[model samples]
Target chain A: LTPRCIIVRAGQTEWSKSGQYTGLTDLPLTPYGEGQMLRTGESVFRNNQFLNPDNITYIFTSPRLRARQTVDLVLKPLSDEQRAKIRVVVDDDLREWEYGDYEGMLTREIIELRKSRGLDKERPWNIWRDGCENGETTQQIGLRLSRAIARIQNLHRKHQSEGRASDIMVFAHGHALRYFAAIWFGLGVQKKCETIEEIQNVKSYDDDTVPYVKLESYRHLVDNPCFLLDAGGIGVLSYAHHNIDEPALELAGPFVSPPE
Target chain B: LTPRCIIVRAGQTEWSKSGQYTGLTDLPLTPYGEGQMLRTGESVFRNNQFLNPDNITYIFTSPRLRARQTVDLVLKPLSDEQRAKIRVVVDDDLREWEYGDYEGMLTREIIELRKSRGLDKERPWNIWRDGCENGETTQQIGLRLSRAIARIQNLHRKHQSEGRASDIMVFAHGHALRYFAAIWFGLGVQKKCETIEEIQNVKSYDDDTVPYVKLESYRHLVDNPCFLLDAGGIGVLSYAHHNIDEPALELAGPFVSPPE
Candidate 1:
């Protein structure tokens, strides 16, 4: 079987439930969200299910309370022996897009603040395009995501070659995971860089010689993404034709027959 | 709650299991595939599950035997009272991308045939790019899908306004469903049109005045899709912020807690 990367969004918190921009500021899952994660873990992470624990090799998650909590609940169904085989890594690179000034602010409140400041006279503020006032830019987020993706891809390559169980799970937040999906398909992240330093700083995914070109039509996705992941949701990414070079999103994974 | 459109691909047939293009050829689901569908139905079709029967208002499926069988098995867990409330439509437009001469042919075999016929010199044969010898073109498929999408969207608008359950389910083939997703996100389907007659002939969805513009960067998806659906797998498409204007693919649906 081809290697797969399973992505899970951290369950809902008070901010998520209230439609607030949640980034950097740590929060735990709400009671309902905790139950949601437990249900997700029980339903899919089992033998003959979408994410069999025995096949999972690694679990990479954001170094945040909610995401780490999500990791624990998702794997709660596994036996001691089954859990022992998997490696869990808490990576800061997988954290939510740093909202900075907009942290904990509602969408309407952010727009009102920007409008009062004469920031969005022509068009409303879009996180993908305008980004946070004092936080991460799109390219900055892309840079870290590329690093995380490279790490995952390298592990997949080694495990695939060895013919071992190679399923990897990623637990992160909404915006970060959506952008990661775009980059997984090789969509352009860096808009344009004039100096070698700017290009060098951005191009950290692979070798130095390769440069990222912006596809104008797909730039909107980088500017205003269309990929959505609800709280406690899950998505899958894998290589088509079992070739690592041709990465594709698994829009839907097959349902295997249940044990009779 | 936001209304969602759940898309399901047909279960494994002999051709699907063997990696052959089975478009336009009627084939029943294999015994294993039947079991797979049954398991899927039991897992996600009950109350509070990912695809709760109570919320689903309509089931649209391809007229193909495989897809119809899948629809049957998927709803097998529902009681007669529950099933009676849901409307099922067998739509011709939902059929698989017609493969024409390549029907029942393996991808390797098709490539070899094209090479022998002095075709695809610069690049290998891609169904999304070159289409089939005498089968459907990308634009033609888009024309029909746009119609179906318009119908679904119209239904959603009315149901959403009424505050009623409006979840819709679609069952079809791999290539067709992937392209359907691209159109769902308002990606360009029509490449270009010269004459008024040509443009009028192609533009069928919604009002006549609105013209379809080609998004060059996103054209590759129309030419060569990246969205994948394994046999018996499911995906979801829904609007963001409960607004019909912002169509988005649900990378992952929120997993709700099961009944106590």
Candidate 2:
């Protein structure tokens, strides 16, 4: 079987439940959020479930407290031996998108604030297009996500070469994970010319504005991402036909049945 | 809450287990596939599960026996009273993608046959680009899917306007449902110009090749669909921010917790 990446959104927090941007905030998961994560762990982490603890080679999580708390709750179902065998990394690349001046504010409040400040008069504010004033741009987020994806891809490649299981787990925030998925398919990070027509239309590669990287299938998600993960939700990403080059999103994955 | 569309792929059949394209050929679900759907039903059909039977206003399944069987198995957990209230329709629009020439063939076998027949010399065979020989084209599939989506959207609109629950369930084949989702977001069916630059680039509406519909977010999935659904897997699609105009793919949905 091909290696798969399991993407998980952290459980809810007070700020998240209240619809506030919780970027860089050091809040913990709500009691309800903890319960949510625990239930999620029980449902997906069993032998015949969506995630088999024995198959997971690595677990990468954000540095935030809420995300770490989620990681603990999700791993609570695993045995000590199984948990010890897997390596866990707290990655800054997996951190939430910095909201900057818009942090701790609601979407409506941000729009209203921008409107009062004579911003977004011609068009409403969009995070994908008009990034936060003092925070990361689409390009910046794309660059870091590119790095993180490359690392994960390399790990999968090594494991596949050695005939070892390599199912990776990522626990992160909503927007960052969504962008990670888009970049995983090279939607925003690379400019690919599939057909001869597209290749002929390609301009100079030296252009600084255009990204030059290996291309993957699926497009337009980078500029307008539509992948949504609710708090404590789980998503899976894997290659088609067991070929790592053809990364595909699993819209619906079957639950593995226990051995008879 | 906004109305949602729950998309389901039919259970695995003998052909599916053997890696053959099972389009249009009537086949029953494998014994294992029946068990798989039952487990999925148990996980998602309860009051606090991913699907609440009471909230599902309608169930639409493909005309195929396997798909209809899947629908039956998936709804087996519901009480008779709950099941009676929900209307089920066997829709032709939800039929599998017609693989006229390539039916009952594996991907490798199909590629070899095409090569032997002096086809696909320029590039490897792609259903999205080349489509099936003597079968439906992308435009044809897109056209029918547009009609089905419009019907579903109208139902949602009516229910939402009346403050009624309107979760819809669709049981269909893999490729057809994936393409259905692409059209649901207007990815392949619309020619939208969002910005001033895009508006200026628009040529004439009379162009036959370009689709003329309202634009939706996320693109390129139509020409190169990356969404995948394993047999017996379930996927969800709904509007973001409760706005019917902005359809989004839910990568991870939280399972409803049982009542305290």
Estimate, for each residue in A64-164, the C-alpha lDDT of model 2 and write its tens digit.
98889998998998999999889887777678888888999999999998888899978788887667878876655655555556567777877899898
The Cα RMSD across the true interface for model 2 is 3.8
Chain B, candidate 2: TM? 0.84
> What DockQ does every candidate get?
0.41, 0.29
Query: Cα deviation in Å at residue B260, candidate 2?
Result: 6.1
Cα distance off (Å), candidate 1, residue B173: 0.8
- Model 1 scores a C-alpha lDDT of 0.76
In model 1, the clashing pairs are: none
TM-score of chain A of each: 0.86, 0.84
Candidate 1 docking DockQ = 0.41
User: In candidate 1 chain A, where is summed lDDT lowest over 10 consecutive residues?
Assistant: A211-220
